[PDB]
Amino acid sequence: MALREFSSVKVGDQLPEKTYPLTRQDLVNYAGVSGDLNPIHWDDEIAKVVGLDTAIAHGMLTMGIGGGYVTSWVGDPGAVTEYNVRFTAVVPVPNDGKGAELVFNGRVKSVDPESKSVTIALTATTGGKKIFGRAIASAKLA
Amino acid sequence: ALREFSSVKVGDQLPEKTYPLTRQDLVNYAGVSGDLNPIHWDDEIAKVVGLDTAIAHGMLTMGIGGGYVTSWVGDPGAVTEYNVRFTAVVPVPNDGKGAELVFNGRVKSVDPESKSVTIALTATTGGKKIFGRAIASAKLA
Amino acid sequence: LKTDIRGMIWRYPDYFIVGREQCREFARAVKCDHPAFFSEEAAADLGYDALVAPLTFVTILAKYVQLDFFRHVDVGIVQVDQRFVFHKPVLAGDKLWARMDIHSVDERFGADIVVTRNLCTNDDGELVMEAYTTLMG
Amino acid sequence: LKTDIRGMIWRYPDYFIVGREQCREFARAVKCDHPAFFSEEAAADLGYDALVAPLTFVTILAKYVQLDFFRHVDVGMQIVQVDQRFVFHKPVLAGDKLWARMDIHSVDDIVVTRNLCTNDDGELVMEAYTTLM
């Protein structure tokens, strides 16, 4: 997997859709890996005191996943120059043996030939509801 | 600083220390260690295999013992062996309180030729031992 | 706001080593699968002499600094926005120095809005990354 | 048993870096408070040029290798770890580069794996024995 050629990309191109599964175990793993041990991401009863149905994925976990998504299309993590996300929705992750699924999509929003940069606007949804507001990534292609 | 060899006598007892352990600690240890086995953070899985509640990782309690032993030695780098047999589980209820592990130790032997000491350790939770043979050695100053 | 913090610059008194094994675990933790996250050969194929860190990795450094700040200045939280600007690729083995500035302070409709800017520089003093976090009250 | 694995050697195909920030986080996760776990200045007082790893840190490495091995040779018929042993021939500090080598030390079910850990110079820095049941 190598760096995508710039000359092959046009504005309006759509990225391949990718669906990622996430289970409570992923949430528990991420808590310790990241240091964010806030119990709303792993204790359902705490979720209820603040008004949620169930524990929710960390915002930075879902953003991190987006980073993996964008890097596979680009072809080089080192090529990415920006990644910006507004968090509009929570991502419930039920402890039901299946969990939740996040579906990521993207469209090329802008290109700048002088720098060989592309800017993608992304969308991510769960059960049909968007979890990001403004969500863009840029990279310098080959 | 590293404890002086000449100050240690066979039979000396280490200070007792109590460590609190909460559910948050177990979830933290799971990700830090990579051991995501749900018996350490999911009560329902624990019950399925016959336990009352999620339990601390064995290596978590051994890890605590290493800190215990290092505070007495005065230098983690001085420890030459650390061996622990696991006999019991440590329930950690998710009730806002958790569990307590009480560590104790006694000097079992000293060796002037190498300036080595060997400690026997014991660890309990609600008074019941969680380790069997549990020893650490170190080369003192 | 409780304490006026506008334009405070908070230099983190410690450096941060971007750790190889920790990166790989972070990568798998956020489901990255590009081989430049995990292999030195794959990263070499793309020109890098160490592995590339997951693009959100420096969130750990950013919050080391943020918590050090709040521990030292009283103000008395949900994160609504996150932005990363990569001026250089951040690799395993990199030594990073962190510096948080208070970019903005507001209090629109209800509670408070602070935008932190986490600056990351390396041992030569060149700028490798900036991270903007928007916190809400 | 099932196939007899006594003395099988599993060479781990990768090296392992003892990471500074991860040691620090691991140390705090198992409630260490000696400053040589966290501060290079404190480690300097004891003679070391980097901070010292938590005495159980190499459990991470040991199970990278064990799972790699057990995932690749499933034998026997719920497995519990009943004993864990660490032998330190040299101090393990942050920044150390380590190579892992596991043999199947003994079998009775009761199997004891032995992980030999060496550095880039080939000297032995530590051994780790875990007993599974």
From Swiss-Prot, chain C:
A family per Pfam: FAS1_DH_region
GO molecular function, one term: (3R)-hydroxyacyl-[acyl-carrier-protein] dehydratase activity
Classification via Gene3D superfamilies: Hotdog Thioesterase
UniProt-listed SUPFAM superfamilies: Thioesterase/thiol ester dehydrase-isomerase
InterPro entries, per database record: FAS1-like_DH_region, HadA-like, HotDog_dom_sf, UPF0336/Enoyl-CoA_hydratase
A GO term from the CC aspect: plasma membrane
Source organism superkingdom: Bacteria
One GO BP annotation of this record: fatty acid biosynthetic process
PANTHER family: HYDROXYACYL-THIOESTER DEHYDRATASE TYPE 2, MITOCHONDRIAL, HYDROXYACYL-THIOESTER DEHYDRATASE TYPE 2, MITOCHONDRIAL-RELATED
Annotated family: Belongs to the UPF0336 family.
Protein name: UPF0336 protein Rv0637
Organism: Mycobacterium tuberculosis (strain ATCC 25618 / H37Rv)
